[PDB]
A paper describes a structure:
Enzymes of the vanillyl alcohol oxidase/p-cresol methyl hydroxylase (VAO/PCMH) superfamily are found across all kingdoms where they perform a range of metabolic functions. These flavoproteins share a conserved FAD-binding domain and a more variable substrate-binding domain that enables interactions with a range of substrates. One of these, the 4-phenol oxidases/dehydrogenases, catalyzes the oxidation of para-substituted phenolic compounds. A fundamental distinction is that the oxidases efficiently react with oxygen producing hydrogen peroxide whereas the dehydrogenases hardly react with oxygen and typically employ other proteins, such as cytochrome c, as acceptors.
Author numbering:
A (entry chain A), B (entry chain B): 43 to 543
């Protein structure tokens, strides 16, 4: 790599003012919440283009100078490494200034976006034009990116929650600087780019998700029509051990699609950590004991597990399924509550917002849980939607975090037939002993979950290799074959998903 | 290629009785319905393994002897080339003996299948075990394969109609003979292979659809729970020119998911061709005129367009949406009819069967339309679900087929935001002039649709290059890069989707 020559060429493409080339100038791309005891996850440079033509020039220069680019959209991957590259010596390719909304079709319920478009922008666009379409917001929201989240296959809480399922058409800058459009996009004068996902011949959009094979410059998305009627619900379960009964009750409702939105099943500990610090619940050096959790949860109108769903359509379509849903959840020991019961409950308000694709007051209390705070790593293993799987995963996760002196703070995102078990590893990152302990605990979570047949849907830069190691040796070798063929100079995001040149 | 050495080694793997190595032995793999005036689409051999270990040995031999393999599951790609390879000198890898149902999960609504599993087998398995799951049948059916059909991204007529969206997990024999499991399948002891589609890192399952990058040896599929209530409907439109009004009415019902199943919008000409020969409607050498079609259609309880949809769930969920659906379709000039009205109507019976995932009596009347019959090529361009697009596509298709002396016989498969415009080019293949004219007509359909920005979701072995040429040069070159890196010896299905070593 010839860094000085690459950065000088970059200034010629975007201007000196959008190239950041020394320790001091790249401070804005350098903060992470993941454990980094060796301080190895840090960029050496940032370049901020406003056009796809600039992106294509940047990629040609990157090849010529063998200078790797770590590409981000808005770079708000909080708990997954923010804008920190997976390996040393990378320049962040920050696409935040490519923030053009390119198309929105009210009739077909579609849009086409540059990567820099924020949830806030797209919400504002729809409201300002009176377009009765909804977005699907992965908790974070405001200055996060539909494009960046969809490319890391993130999740929101409407019927359109599984973001990658609703992506339709993308444009990619390939490692050699050529643009390719997927699906129907490469047909001159096509009006079906956001209409038909697959195109003809191999389906390649997936290659550009959680990967380093290309730079996405445009992406299409399907958007849900605003329903006549929106009815949010909260189910309260009293006991830490109700986990399997909740999964077993929700699964038939989801498999049969009586409930269509991805459901957050929130632990009392996680909910409390949103608005309270740990030392408001229990003293430092005391465990987060069941009795203290139950008391604090109860005083805040929360159970030990709080599961959020919604019904969408007419008063008549809602009336069609609400009785069966209530009877199933009640039989599981759940108390089903509506907005009228949950007035002024901030958790209900948080979920009520998310399940209509609303944006919440951008405020992340989890970062202040323990001591000086500032430590967050998502450990996000998959499970089949089986109560015994949730039961066993919760039990192993609790044993491992408690062994390292950390708390179990978790939610299940319930899908159709699967579950994202989201485990927030919360620590004091400012205390270098605690950062080291959180690193060791995270390694033990990954290793011991993998030995039971469980592994991550998504991970942070500090664990991408160890999570890749849970999956097959053939998978790893095949992704290396693709990398070497697609990006011969190894200049796109080396070590993303454990994929190294 | 060393054909004799390969075929001798293949006998060692599967036994002499499952290797077919000369003109007369390969006749069962050589019949096609597509136009082939040069008789160029024909295998030189066939091999029929019963195990994935046999497949791996066959692929190792193929690489050693440089002998290409054209892989098929059941090989019933009727109107898309059956088991004919896209290029000369290929041995069919016929996987029909790998017909094991590996898993069926009643609770999660999943299965795992070998490629030879037929629709009939899976239906029988579900009924024999009293498992209240449905399958989703692409018209064809009985002896077709859920695996083969999903790998070519075909379509059925339940809410699970878009087969590739419901695939979850696969095992592939890569060109070097190594097995690789996608999604969660490469995690030893994973119970989530059929639960979570994406896995971790680049999503690769699309690479093995409409492609020659791998041999699929196992595939997971999601299956729809049998609903309490199934209510099939037929909408009858009176005029050939109602096309745009039908699409414009269905689109909001589909975009808002009031109607969740892929809807077949059938031309009177196609319906008549299912049960009648052309010379029962008009004399040979007379055009298939609007008056004659209308008369024959009306005599059979059909309109000029007949659109099929179903409602699934309870009496209450059905009652929730049926009024809005009726009002919308009636306002478009459609007459909405139920089973009670359409008693003994064989078209209603045909669609009523499809839309509950039933299998029809395996009888393909389309193959006897004109003269000696035997000529069928699907021309299957995509459209955005816009009335004006259907209007313009129908108009150009009719002008081109009519200019070559053929009829417009077509259906639209209505999807969420897309249409599959399925044009059946019916011809007398036994008349070598008529086969030549159908070849020329087919070339004119692809080239002139492509000039208007329209191209195929799927195409027969005779047109795979001309359809690839409609899509981008960067797409073509990128698929060649992947082919060369994934299959260095070019031994899997050369020319599939226009992809050549
Ligand atoms: C309290 C809290 C709650 C959260 N809740 C959720 C949640 O419910 N669901 C969820 O999904 N996430 C959640 N997150 C995680 C995270 O904040 C979001 O997923 C966020 O949307 C990701 O940041 P982003 O949108 O800026 O994407 P980016 O950081 O811009 O993109 C993420 C990654 O995608 C790739 N990438 C991005 N753009 C491109 C491009 N143009 N071409 C190629 N590769 C590219 C890169 O690998 C990049 O690191 C949460 C985080 C916190 C702290
Ligand atoms: C009247 C009529 C109506 C039809 N209606 C429909 C319809 O509604 N919907 C529809 O989708 N089709 C329809 N078809 C087309 C066709 O009959 C079906 O799509 C059928 O399911 C395909 O044949 P098959 O299942 O045997 O798959 P195969 O022919 O076995 O597979 C198709 C292709 O997939 C690939 N392939 C298959 N197995 C593998 C493997 N294991 N590894 C790698 N590649 C593999 C090969 O390219 C192969 O040619 C219709 C045909 C007719 C004549
Ligand atoms: C379902 O995905 C996620 C959810 C959250 C918080 O609910 C954090 C990270 C994720 O990846
Ligand atoms: C939706 O796909 C298809 C449908 C049909 C129905 O005649 C035939 C071939 C196809 O590919």
């Amino acid at each position: 790599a010839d860094f000085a020559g690459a950065m000088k060429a970059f200034r010629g493409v975007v201007g000196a003012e959008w190239v950041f080339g020394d320790e001091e100038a790249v401070v804005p791309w350098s903060k992470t919440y993941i454990p980094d005891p060796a301080h190895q996850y840090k960029p050496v440079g940032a370049v901020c283009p406003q056009s796809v033509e600039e992106v294509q020039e940047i990629v040609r220069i990157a090849n010529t100078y063998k200078q790797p680019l770590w590409t981000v959209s808005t770079g708000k991957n909080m708990g997954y490494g923010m804008t920190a590259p997976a390996t040393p010596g990378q320049v962040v390719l920050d696409l935040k200034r490519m923030n053009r909304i390119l198309e929105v079709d009210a009739d077909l319920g579609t849009c086409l976006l540059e990567p820099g478009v924020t949830y806030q922008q797209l919400k504002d666009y729809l409201e300002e034009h009176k377009i009765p379409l909804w977005i699907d917001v992965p908790t974070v929201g405001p200055i996060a990116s539909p494009v960046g989240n969809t490319l890391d296959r993130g999740v929101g809480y409407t019927p359109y929650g599984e973001h990658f399922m609703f992506q339709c058409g993308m444009e990619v800058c390939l490692p050699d600087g050529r643009l390719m459009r997927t699906g129907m996009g490469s047909i001159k004068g096509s009006t079906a780019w956001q209409a038909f996902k697959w195109g003809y011949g191999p389906y390649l959009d997936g290659l550009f998700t959680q990967s380093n094979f290309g730079i996405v410059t445009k992406m299409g998305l399907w958007l849900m029509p605003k329903p006549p009627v929106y009815k949010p619900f909260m189910v309260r379960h009293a006991n830490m051990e109700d986990v399997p009964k909740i999964i077993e009750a929700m699964r038939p409702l989801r498999v049969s699609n009586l409930v269509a939105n991805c459901n957050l099943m929130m632990s009392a500990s996680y909910q409390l950590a949103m608005f309270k610090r740990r030392n408001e619940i229990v003293p430092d050096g005391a465990p987060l004991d069941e009795a203290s959790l139950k008391k604090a949860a109860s005083a805040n109108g929360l159970g030990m597990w709080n599961t959020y769903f919604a019904l969408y359509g007419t008063e008549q379509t809602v009336a069609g399924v609400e009785p069966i849903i209530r009877a199933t959840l009640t039989a599981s020991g759940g108390e089903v509550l509506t907005a009228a019961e949950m007035e002024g409950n901030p958790w209900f308000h948080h979920h009520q917002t998310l399940m209509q694709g609303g944006l919440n007051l951008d405020e992340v209390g989890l970062l202040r849980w323990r001591g000086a705070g500032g430590g967050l790593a998502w450990f996000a293993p998959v499970a089949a939607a089986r109560g015994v799987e949730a039961e066993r995963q919760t039990a192993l996760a609790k044993e491992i975090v408690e062994k390292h002196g950390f708390d179990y703070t978790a939610a299940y995102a319930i899908g159709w037939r699967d579950l994202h078990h989201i485990i927030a590893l919360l620590f004091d990152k400012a205390d270098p002993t605690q950062e080291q302990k959180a690193d060791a605990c995270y390694r033990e979570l990954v290793t011991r979950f993998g030995a039971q047949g469980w592994a991550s849907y998504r991970t942070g830069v500090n664990s991408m290799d160890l999570v890749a190691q849970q999956y097959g040796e053939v998978n790893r070798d095949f992704n290396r074959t693709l990398k070497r063929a697609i990006d011969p100079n190894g200049i796109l995001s080396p070590g993303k998903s454990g994929i190294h040149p």
